[PDB]
Structure formats: structure tokens, C-alpha cells
Amino acid sequence: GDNNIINPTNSDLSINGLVNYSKTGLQTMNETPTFDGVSTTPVYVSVPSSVGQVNGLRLSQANKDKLLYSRTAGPEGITMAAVIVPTISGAEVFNFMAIGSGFSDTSNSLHLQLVIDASGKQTIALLLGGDGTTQILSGDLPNDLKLQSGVPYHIAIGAKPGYFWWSILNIQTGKRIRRSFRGAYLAVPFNSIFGLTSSLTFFSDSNAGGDACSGVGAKVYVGMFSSENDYVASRYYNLINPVDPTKLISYRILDSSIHH
Amino acid sequence: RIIGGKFIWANWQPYGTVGQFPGITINNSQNMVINGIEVQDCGGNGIEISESYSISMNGLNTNRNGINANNTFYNIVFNKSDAVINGFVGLNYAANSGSGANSSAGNFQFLSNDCSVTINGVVETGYMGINFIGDNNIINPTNSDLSINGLVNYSKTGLQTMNETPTFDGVSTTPVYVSVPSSVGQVNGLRLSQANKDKLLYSRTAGPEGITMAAVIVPTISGAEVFNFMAIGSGFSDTSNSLHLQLVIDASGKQTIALLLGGDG
Ligand SMILES: [Cl-]
């Protein structure tokens, strides 16, 4: 899109009237998620020093580690973001984050996925189920845009009726990839994803069987809906911080703790 | 780039076109910078922005459109579009003069909820209101990605704030609650009666910077009555230092909205 490499700055910058999270003392809500896994004890492992913390949450397919929020998506929409340091090897589906669960005409669900095939080809896929139908919006990444094993990425989505965007930002090089879907790209608006019935999950979805992720998670943010405009504007302050302190609903660093 | 523009008397009814057409159509467009324009006196909507990206407007005056049907059309209509509008003004000269001439129902209308829009400026001008109306006389809220006047939308915020506790007071001091219409978005509200004198007292006093007070009120209107919707202080006299906002109903059913001020001698 327009901003393909983002270099953040410690200048005296104000962009889009957004409060820079690093410069704020405002008090906000901070909802608490529940850890879930096959074993329900969280495990923490180290992250690269670019993540700005010692450890993050260990993500594996075997234990299905994830963070469940009870909050459901509403018609104004939601933003969800996290640092994920993916371990990438063979065929795999990573569910980076989800609203609800399942995938059918009535699932009322969203999944953002990275799918690696057996040959190493990578696809980014957004799965929408609801309003009587389903849609897969996916694309195969060219070789030079592929995610790299052990590199941290800031991964974000904005999702509301009729309006879905996703972004994947390498925090070491500033290089970003993204897509946005409105209008004729969507088969329906997917209103029923946002009927206050489908809850938010990081690193899997809200069903016990769902695919999860492999690697490490950190700096989980839930906010009310931000445009990609405002998401990108906020990246000029810092590549991994919360998007919009005035819309922040949860933010958990996950440095060996689910608290704050 | 359009720098300096005036677009007036569009959709001119004598020329006999069938249907509504806005003063300005921006359709399927992008990266436009439109500064210092006026749209006024048009027969339908003022500006319709449709299927457009990145429309930038810096200094924009839209007012007194919708002249073919009173209280029906809007100054700017957004449909699947993004825009950034700064230095917006739109004093509705007909509403200000009290002529009763047909004019726009209000400034903005969103036909879709997938628009990303920021609007800053003088959205309601603040003239007296000789016929009790102004620039925005019908307001339709939107779930789109809107930011207006830099205001945080309460539906979208987690910010923590003060929240002062008022004291209920009444002839009996136990509050009673009764059903509200579902458009109020709750099951019950506070039962207001003249018999019990139900009221909420805040100890906060008004200061020179001033105050904003607001509430949903569902009035039961019948015989002659004075409703005190809200007040500052009490009494009414040269030294009461008080404000009251009242609906006054007479025996015949006439309604008066009165603001009483006492103070400064
Ligand atoms: Cl903990």
C-alpha cells in the first residue's frame, strides 16, 4: 500500500491526533483474558530483544496455547493486534487471532491465518462465516514477502461489518504487507459476526479443537475499531505499542505473566 | 485541485429535471484537494461523495441546500467513501433569519457504515434560533469509522474518568424506577413525579468555565404544569444566582420552553 516500510521516530510527532502510547499516563480499561491450553499452565520462552521484553507466551500446536477474552465483537467493530514470533517449518495453519469459532454459513466467525504448505509456500487467509454464507479471502505471498522463522512481526486486524483489514509488519526491518476488504470485495457485510455473540481469541479461536500457532506471542492489544489509516499513523511512534490509547480495551505484555 | 469555488442553485426546480441531484457529485474519484468552496441554495443534497478515496477539503462552506423539499436533504452525503474535511462552516441563513424557507435537514448523512471520515469545524453555528431550529435539525447517528471535532466517541472508548455520585431526594427518599421505551437502551429509568418531587442533587457547584448537563427525559404531558428539567442553584430573583430550564404547559396545552436566570442584580 502506501506505507511499505515504517521507521518509527522519537521525534516530537503528533499524527492524526493520536496519543502516543509511550507518552501517555491516561488510565483505561484493561480486560483480563483467560489462558487456555491442553495443559492450562502458561509457558514462557525468550523473545528477540527487538520485542522490548525478556520472554513472551510460548505458542505450540501440541498444547494449543491461546488467550480467550469473553468480550464479544459488536457492530462498531474491533481491532486486535499482537507480536508473534512464528516458528516456521513444515505444513501448518497458524490461527493468529479469531472472533468466535468454526467456519460455516452460521459460524459468525473470523479467522486470520498464515497457512504454510508442504512445499513452503505461504498464504495469508481471512475466513469469514456468517450472514448465510462463507468467504475465504486469501493470497499466496511472493517468495520475497514470506515471513521468516524466529523474526518478530506485529500482526493487526481491524474488523467491523463491511470492513476488514489486516497487516503484518516485520519489526526488525520495518517492512509491511497488508490487504483491506470493503465493497465489492466482500460477498456480504458479515453483519452476524458482530451480533454480540462471538468472543475474541488470540493465537487460536474459541473452540477447544481449533488450530493454534507455533512460536511466541507478546503485547496483545484489543481496541475499539481503528482504520488502517490510524494503525499505520500509530506505527510511526513505535512499531509494537497499542494502536489508540483512547480506544484501548486490553493490553497484556505477556512477559512471564498474564497481568499488568 | 479546486482552490476557491462557489456552486449555487443546483437542481434548480424550474429547469424541470426529474429527480434529485446534488450541488456536487464526487463519484469514483481519489486524491482530490478541494479548498475554499461554498455549496449553497441547491435543490437537493449539497455534496454527495460516493465510492471515493482520499478526498481532502480545507475550508468548506455548505448551507441552506435541500431547497426543493424542507427538512429532507443533507449538506454532505457520504456513501462508501473516505474523506478528511477541515475548517468546515455552514451557517444556515434561512434558519438564522427565521424566513421559513425550505432548507437542509442537517449537515451530514452516512449512507453506509464502511466510510472512514474525519470532519472538523463549526458543525452547529450557534445563532439564536428564532424558529427553534438551526443547522442540524435532524440528526442520524452512524456506526461508521467517523471522527468529528477530535471528539472521543463514548461507544468506542475505554478511558477512565471521574464519575460523581448524586444524592436522590424526594418527599419519600427511596427512588422508584419504571419502564422506558426500548430506544432508551435500558429496561427502567428513574420515576419522576411532582407528588414525590423526585430529583438528583449533585453537590458540585457551577464555576466560571461553565457546565454541560444532559439527560434522557420521557415526559408525561397532561394538564397545566411546570417541569424543571434541570437547574443550577434554586429560587428566582435578583440574587438567586440560579438557572432553570423548564417546559411550561398551560391549561389549553400550549408548551413554552423557558430559561430563567437570576443574578448579577
Ligand atoms: Cl499471571
Angle CA A232–A234–A238, to nearest 5 = 110
Name every chain B residue with its beta carbon within 8 A of the beta carbon of A189.
114
- Note which residues in 57-86 of chain B have CB less than 8 A from chain A: 80, 82
What's the CA-to-centroid distance between A109 and ligand 1, angstroms?
A: 28
Here the cell at position B76 is 454532505
Q: Which of A165, A191, A196, A229 to mutate to test the interface with B (most CBs of B within 10 A)?
A: A229
Residues 6+ apart with CB under 8 A from B143: A75, A76, A77, A160, A161, B113
Decide if A189 contacts A162 (C-beta within 8 A): yes
Spatial distance between the Cα atoms of B105 and B38, rounded to a whole number of angstroms: 18
User: Scanning the structure block, which residue is given the C-alpha cell 429560587?
Assistant: B235
Contact state of A225 with B156 under an 8 Å Cβ cutoff = yes
Residue by residue, DSSP assigns A55-88 as EEEEE-TTTT-EEEEEEEP-TT-EEEEEEEEE--
List residues, by chain if needed, whose CB lies under 5 Å from ion ligand 1.
A 257-258
Answer whether A184 touches B (CB < 8 Å).
no
Q: Which among A29, A75, A247 has the least Cβ separation from residue B143?
A: A75
Experimental approach taken: X-ray
What's the CA-to-centroid distance between A258 and ligand 1, angstroms?
A: 4
What resolution does the deposited structure have, in angstroms? Answer: 1.9
> A175 forms bridges with which residues in the sheet?
A5
Pairing verdict, β A122-130 and B106-110: unpaired
Q: Which among A28, A163, A183 has the least Cβ separation from residue B158?
A: A28
Answer whether A1 touches B (CB < 8 Å).
no
Write out chain B in H/E/C secondary structure. Answer: CEEEEEEECCCCHHHCCCCCCCCEEEECCCCEEEEEEEEECCCCCCEEEECCCCEEEEEEEEECCCCCCCCCCEEEEEECCEEEEEEEECCCHHHHHCCCCCCCCEEEEECCCCCEEEEEECCCCCCCCCCCCCCCCCCCCCCCEEEECCCCCHHHCCECCCCCCCEEECCCCCCCEEECCHHHCCCEEECCCCCCCCEEECCCCCCCCCCCCCCCCCCCCCCCEEEEEEEECCCCCCCCCEEEEEEEECCCCCEEEEEEEECCC
Residues 6+ apart with CB under 8 A from A161: A75, A77, A189, A190, A191, A193, A194, B113, B114, B143
Q: Which among B51, B155, B159 has the least Cβ separation from residue A246?
A: B159
